[PDB]
Design a protein around this nucleic acid. Structure first.
Ligand SMILES: Nc1ncnc2c1ncn2[C@@H]1O[C@H](COS(=O)(=O)NC(=O)[C@@H](N)CCC(=O)O)[C@@H](O)[C@H]1O
Ligand SMILES: [Cl-]
Ligand SMILES: [Mg+2]
Length: 468
RNA sequence: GGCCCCAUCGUCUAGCGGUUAGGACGCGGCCCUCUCAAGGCCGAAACGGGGGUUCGAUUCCCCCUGGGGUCACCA
């Protein structure tokens, strides 16, 4: 059938590139009624960042993905952490040794640096060590690595499902280290052994790996295994076209979550990076994505990750895809994180409704609608100016307001409209300064809905401090 | 620098021999209107260069340019 996987490396924050690739693997597996695996590639102890693994697993679930086999969901071919499979790689590295497909190299890091300076890259000198002496020197505990014994001279063909066949000259393929002197494997060894053992048949990873692929094709041969299909995706980029990175862009998924980006939108956005719906539609669900997926509709150029369009899409979701109630729920954490409180669910909901079209991130709601939840709100210089200029007519309106019994948006509007008429003045000349008195701002939702919201007492109690 | 991949508006893209080269973000204008948004309408904005193939190239082939990847006991 079809078995795909995402093989994150726990070395930092949950990378957006990781989500991007995981999405295409998830779609392809489901579209074929296959399996989607998660394998944690923690083989480099120097770059290992404790706490990374949980964070990446949480981020994929947050985005809406699900996996069938993995670290925390079990599976027939585990463990799903390479660090727990160490003995396994040893066994296969030694098997290559016997098949004559690899050799032991004893050079120190320093000698290798020197060889690289003279000949540029390892020259395979350890191949000239009699196999018996190599084995003997190993039993003595002498530190060493196992390298892939590339067939020289020759040519190695890689088949990319998206670009056709690409020919590599074995002279372009180094005798890569398979097993490190600390007994840990290199990405190359672990990847093939594990992809094979876990049944993967469709390898989808970014294009940065295409040139390493020939090494993998040769490993599958050395073991006498069948190679899976390869699909190399384009690399997400910084605005300056360089491979996306933390110094020039936001690459951390936990950053997007903390900024109030809806996971559904971030997901939707990531799908338009190298893929597009038949009918050009750009707002769609994860389920529609799976259903429409097709390699024929994948673009191969490296897409710039545009934060502005992401904000736009996030706002589109907030106002057209989610219900008023879903938005009101997702806003709470951000209200709490801002130290604001809401009286009740009804109040919150109405507040969110009034602001729905005025914020693109959940974090912006507490910011722009602060005056609706606390009395501790800023007053813009522009709002203060408009307040003083209209102070006189607000004083003449105050008594009319205190007299008003039906505190409804409809009633209030008819009241103020009439007040502006009799005073021979545009509603705006009385509506603008009242807005500043109530909100401390000049950019808010409709006055009547804002006036009604708090209730007669609350609204007037604030209008009074303004006239004071 | 060697090797490999890629190439339509500023950005994400549709196109898959013949189109007024379409859509989206963003940008400008207009309508809406009590502010700001949201929404609607209009607009400016692209096929990197040179060869070919073909009646006919954005599209098919070659070269150059640009961008990216890799040449690590990193992934
Ligand atoms: N800027 C970018 N744009 C788009 N995709 C990007 C990316 N950066 C990383 N990726 C892709 O995300 C997945 C995991 O990245 S990663 O944590 O560094 N780990 C690894 O690359 C290796 N553990 C796995 C390689 C493989 O899948 O065979 C891998 O599929 C990797 O290719
Ligand atoms: Cl990074
Ligand atoms: Mg145009």
């Amino acid at each position: 059938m079809v078995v795909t996987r995402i093989a994150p490396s726990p070395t930092g924050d949950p990378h957006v590139g990781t989500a991007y690739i995981a999405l295409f693997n998830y779609a392809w597996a489901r579209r074929n009624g296959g399996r989607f695996i998660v394998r944690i590639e923690d083989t480099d102890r120097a770059r290992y960042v404790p706490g990374a693994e949980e964070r990446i697993l949480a981020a994929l679930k947050w985005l809406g993905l699900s996996y069938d086999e993995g670290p925390d969901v079990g599976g027939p071919h585990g463990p799903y952490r390479q660090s727990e499979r160490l003995p396994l790689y040893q066994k296969y590295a030694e098997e290559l040794l016997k098949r004559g497909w690899a050799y032991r190299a004893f050079e120190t890091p320093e000698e290798l640096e020197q060889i690289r300076k003279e000949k540029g890259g390892y020259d395979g000198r350890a191949r000239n060590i009699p196999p018996e002496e190599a084995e003997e020197r190993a039993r003595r505990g002498e530190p060493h690595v196992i390298r892939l014994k590339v067939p020289r001279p020759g040519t190695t063909e890689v088949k990319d499902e998206l670009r056709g066949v690409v020919v590599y000259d074995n002279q372009e393929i180094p005798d890569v280290v398979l097993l490190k002197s600390d007994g840990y494997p290199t990405y190359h060894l672990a990847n093939v052994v594990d992809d094979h053992l876990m049944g993967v048949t469709d390898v989808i990873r970014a294009e940065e790996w295409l040139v390493s692929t020939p090494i993998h094709v040769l490993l599958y041969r050395a073991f006498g295994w069948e190679a899976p299909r390869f699909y190399h995706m384009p690399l997400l980029r910084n605005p300056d076209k360089t491979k996306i990175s933390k110094r020039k862009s936001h690459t951390s998924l936990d950053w997007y979550k903390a900024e109030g980006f809806l996971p559904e939108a971030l997901r939707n956005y990531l799908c338009l990076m190298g893929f597009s719906m038949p009918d050009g539609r750009e707002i769609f669900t994860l389920e529609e994505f799976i259903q429409a997926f097709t390699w024929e509709r994948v673009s191969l150029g490296g897409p710039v990750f545009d934060l502005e369009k992401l904000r736009w899409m996030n706002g589109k979701y907030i106002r057209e895809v989610l219900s008023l109630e879903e938005v009101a729920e997702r806003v709470k954490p951000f209200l709490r994180e801002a130290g604001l409180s809401w009286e009740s669910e009804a109040y919150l909901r109405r507040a969110v409704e009034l602001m729905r079209p005025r914020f693109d991130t959940l974090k912006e709601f507490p910011e722009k609608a602060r005056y609706l939840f606390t009395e501790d709100y800023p007053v813009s210089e522009k709002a203060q100016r408009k307040l003083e200029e209209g102070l006189p007519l607000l004083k003449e309106l105050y008594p009319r307001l205190r007299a008003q019994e039906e505190w409804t948006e409809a009633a209030l509007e008819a009241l103020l409209r009439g007040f502006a008429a009799e005073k021979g003045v545009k509603l705006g000349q009385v509506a603008q300064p009242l807005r500043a008195a109530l909100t401390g701002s000049l950019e808010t939702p409709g006055l009547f809905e804002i006036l009604a919201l708090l209730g007669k007492e609350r609204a007037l109690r604030r209008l009074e401090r303004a006239l004071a």
